[PDB]
Design a protein around this nucleic acid. Structure first.
Lengths: 123, 111
RNA sequence: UCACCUGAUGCCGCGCUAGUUACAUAUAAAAGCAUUAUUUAAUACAAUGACAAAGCCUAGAAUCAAUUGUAAACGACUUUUGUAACAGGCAAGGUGUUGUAAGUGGUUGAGCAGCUGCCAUACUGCGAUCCACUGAAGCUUAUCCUUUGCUUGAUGAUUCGA
RNA sequence: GAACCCGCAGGUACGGACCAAUGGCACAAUACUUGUUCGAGCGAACAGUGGUAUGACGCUACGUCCGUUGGAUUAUGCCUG
RNA sequence: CUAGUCGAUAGAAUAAUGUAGGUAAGGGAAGUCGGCAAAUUAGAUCCGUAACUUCGGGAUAAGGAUUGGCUCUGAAGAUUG
RNA sequence: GGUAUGCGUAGAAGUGUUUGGCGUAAGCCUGCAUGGAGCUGCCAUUGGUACAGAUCUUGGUGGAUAGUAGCAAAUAAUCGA
RNA sequence: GGAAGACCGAAACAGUUCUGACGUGCAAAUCGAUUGUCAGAAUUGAGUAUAGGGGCGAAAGACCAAUCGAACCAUCUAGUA
């Protein structure tokens, strides 16, 4: 989160810290063609695609070196990323279709008849 | 609509270049040509031709002479069919008597 | 908008209640008989929301980007955009600012040299500076004032409902 | 010898600000200028701001313009008892 | 000039404080441990030079004047006399 | 070393666990999911036997930052191909 | 007439005051301003001597390979508390 101090445009994202990461937006731009050039094998028209599900993890760091005060050494590890993307079509979402369990016997139906049958309910 | 037009501009350049120090004035004054072009043109890849260097780096870094007469030539990109197609061509017109030398466009489209 | 009175429309006379007496009934019983138990819930009240149902009313902003400059470490904050009242680039006027350019020409001169010629005693090619054309000249909004002169000009994206 | 009560004039320190004038700092814009290259004539060409003098926008202090009125009630005097 | 380099992360931006280069009207050590950072002086010619001296100094003492550019005359030589 | 005609590619050891349970408690038993070749219970013995610690040794890994600190000395780079 | 361990000064070296610049540096001692000698007790490349309770020291217990009131490296050394 910071220290990236401000920039103006991120008010569409409602908290005012943002950046424009040149190297981080190269490597997804080709990759989102390396995604976009795989549904065309499958014959799907790509307009009806939207981004489904996307995460980014870490990986095996390097070790370059830096040289510092009084003679000593500290690592300079730049830590790479894996980028994983799945692109689905314009689908739906579902809640559930549910059912209920009764178990009726001799002395439970009449109370329903006491409020529905013998007493005529006006709608 | 044609927009290949070619005007005979004029410029104040020191007025563009207060609030910068010297030693960057004036190789600022050619990356503040690239705002001076497109505020009158709109188009993007302002290819500054090498004739304009030998009057801007003429006195040296300390002062560009305060008044140039650049020819804005919005010339179409013949090839390299990138999404941009209209770029501007600049040259150098070394007139020297600057009082009432009016800015205009009467310029045939093949000089 | 709201309760009250009144101008006055109209005619509910739709439905009132009490006391005594008679009548036509329908309904109403969950052996549960030391029964309650995670105590229903209908009615009704309001709260609702959803679904196809129900008529009506309705015809915008914000947000950055791009600006500008009364703001400024950034963001925020003041503004701006008519086929052009303006924005905006220029020129032009005015304000100032060093002091009087280059260009010629000059009685402008310390003089020294060339011919100083035979007479006219001359031309300068030399001359630091001074004088005229000259309060000239360049600078002037970038964080100036001025427009009836001159040209440029709209076609973006992104969010939001009681 | 009442700087009595008060009125008048002023002044100190901080306090809040602005810039018309005046002080500062410099449009490193411009005039005289040394050294070197630009062949000679313009420049301010480069000496990490050559040095010099005046110098407008601002910004600033040494300058400027400003900074006040209601209500309880101690100390206390009295009021009536 | 001759040879060779732009190699020190970048385009941008005028906040403090810091980092180094500065000038600031008055007075000029009050400042602070203390004249320490910092300012004047600086080259050369012409004088003009104090006390103490081992008579070699102190001596650049201090205390001063003078210093462009441009136009000229006066002087310091060599060979053939 | 004795032992249970001990289970074991028709899934044995550890690894996870929002399956289930026994103890006062240390600890097991159990289901599913990996996994691929060996394992435990009674009773005799016994060894370098159970770890939160030692400014503990070694190997991953945090927050700060995983994008802050700062990459500011050597005049300074520039358009077009 | 140009002698002296004579003077102001430059690459050679030194390292003073600022107690200024970084003090997770440019660095296990350096950069930038300042200051001293500068024709000899000067400055220095190579060769060679000198050895751990000693070498060497225009003398501080400095220096002896980033260690110096005794190094530096393996042991008697899992030395004792």
């Amino acid at each position: 989160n910071g220290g990236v101090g401000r920039c103006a445009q991120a008010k569409q994202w409602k908290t005012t810290q943002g950046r424009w990461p040149k190297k981080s937006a190269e490597f997804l731009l080709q990759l989102l063609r390396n995604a976009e050039a795989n549904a065309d094998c499958k014959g799907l028209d790509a307009d009806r695609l939207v981004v489904h599900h996307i995460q980014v993890n870490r990986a095996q760091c390097l070790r370059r070196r830096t040289y510092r005060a009084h003679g000593r050494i500290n690592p300079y590890m730049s830590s790479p990323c894996h980028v994983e993307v799945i692109l689905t079509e314009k689908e739906e979402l579902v809640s559930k279709a549910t059912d209920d369990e009764p178990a009726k016997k001799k002395l439970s139906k009449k109370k329903l008849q006491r409020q529905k049958e013998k007493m005529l309910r006006s709608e | 609509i044609n927009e290949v037009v070619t005007r005979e501009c004029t410029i104040h350049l020191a007025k563009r270049v207060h609030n910068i120090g010297f030693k960057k004035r004036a190789p600022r004054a050619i990356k503040e040509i690239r705002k001076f072009a497109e505020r009158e043109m709109g188009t993007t890849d302002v290819r500054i031709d090498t004739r304009l260097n030998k009057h801007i780096w003429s006195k040296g870094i300390r002062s560009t002479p305060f008044r140039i007469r650049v020819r804005l030539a919005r010339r179409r990109n013949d090839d390299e069919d990138s999404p941009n197609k209209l770029y501007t061509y600049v040259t150098y017109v070394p007139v020297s008597t600057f009082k009432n030398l009016q800015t205009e466009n009467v310029e045939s489209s093949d000089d």
